[model samples]
Target: MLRSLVQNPKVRARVLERVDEFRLNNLSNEEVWFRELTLCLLTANSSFISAYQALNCLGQKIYYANEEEIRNILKSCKYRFYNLKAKYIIMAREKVYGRLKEEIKPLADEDQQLARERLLNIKGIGMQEASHFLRNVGYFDLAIIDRHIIDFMRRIGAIGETNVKQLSKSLYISFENILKSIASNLNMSVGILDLFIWYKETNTIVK
Candidate 1:
């Protein structure tokens, strides 16, 4: 029980610290996440030097592209398949610059999903990666279901089902049940609760 843990001040302290650690090391809020996504995408499945070079090259090529543009550049992997990622990055730069034409603030209220779909349509972006990018971009509606998350959910008895592909939908429901119960008893944001649980699962073993 998360409820019992939330009631214990020491456990609460650990939860807060662990969540903050995850934020500092892995997830980023809005501003920091944009750059983090770019760096991560370029580095994904690549060697250190090559990833560094790709990041540098992409940066120089799209110096004027906003954070969203940078995220798009890194989020898509099509370029890796045929040496076209960089070329697409160039085209993407121009496309973003031309569309913004003025100040590049967050996307309009209704345009968020459309922008996300565009990123997914690019050659290399997949559902989970796209979801991760979306989360970094401030879409709290999406959550990641990677190896660590799955293992932690199983270890914690949060997920009892055996189907892997169904885990995302299943976990979403399970987490919501916990969150609703916790929020009813403790009165905290469900989003914050989800983040804290994630940190707890991932970092309890690390330190």
Candidate 2:
């Protein structure tokens, strides 16, 4: 099932197009990269449409807007935890906005995990979200193992159901390792494999 999805010409083309467009070339555009990061930040405990709409409405004002203004934008979009997301956005902008590309470039050259670890220093990014941000902007090795992938993995019997209430480094990597091995056999990066599964479940390839 998964192999057929990855082999489908339409799915593969759309996912690969997304993968190529998100390559290292993003380094040249700081604002675009930052916007992508903001998108990742907004996704937690929220829907993607709300995140995308809020991001589009906020634009670059995230770098300059005060808490009230940012919160208002999110509120308009009916996003969850507008106040908290506003605070996080401001903090991330102050700490990570302009310098993001430079900060991650050399570190990513060393290892994508190194870059992901740096993103974790920010307020909102967890392991999955960190990989989400990295894979959206220039890194392609890490897996964004959100609940969608977790459920898919279980449905396919790739992993046993265990009570994973929290994300430990060890547990996360074990699931990630499963994806890695499957990707290796499929001749695709884990990042692209994630995209394929994303499409398989959603029937859309906007990512």
Candidate 3:
């Protein structure tokens, strides 16, 4: 059943297009950004929306228009493991902004390795998390990881085994070959295929 979902081209395209909502909603404001990032990580292994709004159960709070403001808002909201997200947001923002600012000039200091290293230094910026922010903020040409990709890799026989840590390698070498063929044939991003699988698994239809 899960395997079948990943193979559906129409489903894959819709999912891929819909995720732009997250990328668009992310930088809307401090509150929106914090909530979106929190949802992104939480949704990596859990549900979206409700589980996302669960963060607000902490309390009514206000975050400034900066990453540090995310910390204070979550603190006021009384989140579980607030420190992890707080530190990560700050580190990711620094790397994201610093590189973008540099890229705007005559000479660009945008370095993938540097961005990766800086993100890795943060507590909760796992490979997937870092890759996600880097792609969203700087438009880095990298694949983000999550259960959706893992499921796809396994279904397509790309992954002989399943695990989060090796997901990118397995997906890129194997799973992405699947995506390349599909995307080339149909013109879609692998990211959309991910969303399709999610929607299929949850039996969700946006419209």
Candidate 4:
């Protein structure tokens, strides 16, 4: 649709400056996803696992672990609230476990928004984690609108000085559109734009 706006940004390096495109492969083994999904389920409440996962992506299959067993793993990693996070991971696994790629792929194809809506049914996922999880499956158009991203949006002129009170329900979609619009200008998916924006802040290219 925006053939002209992105047309010939003209040089690959110049185009590179505008968007980072930390490309993510949409597919992975069921074992890898369980860890990635659990890491994020654990993350909605904290960041220890965030750093932990950077060093460790390959791990025991969470698909086989029940909550207490999962709790043991969290404790080994020194993740706080092992009790609660593990509980939620099991709760979420009941919802998404076996389906894995089979689930997200159908949903991502039918309606991305619907996919996020449905994903929110899982225990630990808020808007932030739902988008984060979907991004793993390659539905990068969704926005991970946490508080920091909200502030970043303001700086980039995606959002105005108006205060964003709560990033839930319609409020989430409202701001997501602003970022989505920005992505559209580059003929880019919000997923790619989000990774670029993330690199801008964290100085890390691979997520």
Clashes of each: 2, 0, 1, 1
- State the lDDT of candidate 2 residue by residue for 103-138, as single tens digits: 887888789988888889999989988888888887
lDDT string for model 1 (68-164, tens) is 5554555553335224444444454444433331222244134544544555554444444544454444443444434555566567676664665
Model 1: what TM-score?
A: 0.46
Deviation (Å) of 60 in candidate 4? 1.4
Off by over 4 Å in 1: 1-118, 165-194, 201-207
| Top-scoring candidate (TM-score) | 2
Candidates 3 and 4 compared: the better one by lDDT is: 4
Model 4 agreement with the true structure over 111-164: per-residue lDDT tens digits? 889888887777787888888777766677788777788888788766677666
lDDT of 3 by residue, 1-207 (tens): 445666677775665555566456433444444444444443334355443443454223322235566666655654554556656555545544334333321121256435544555545656666555444433333445566666765775655665656555445445545654554444545444444545755666331
**Model 2 TM-score, 2 decimals:** 0.93
Ranking by lDDT: 2, 4, 3, 1
lDDT of 2 at 23: 81
Which candidate, 1 or 2, would have the higher TM-score against the true structure?
2
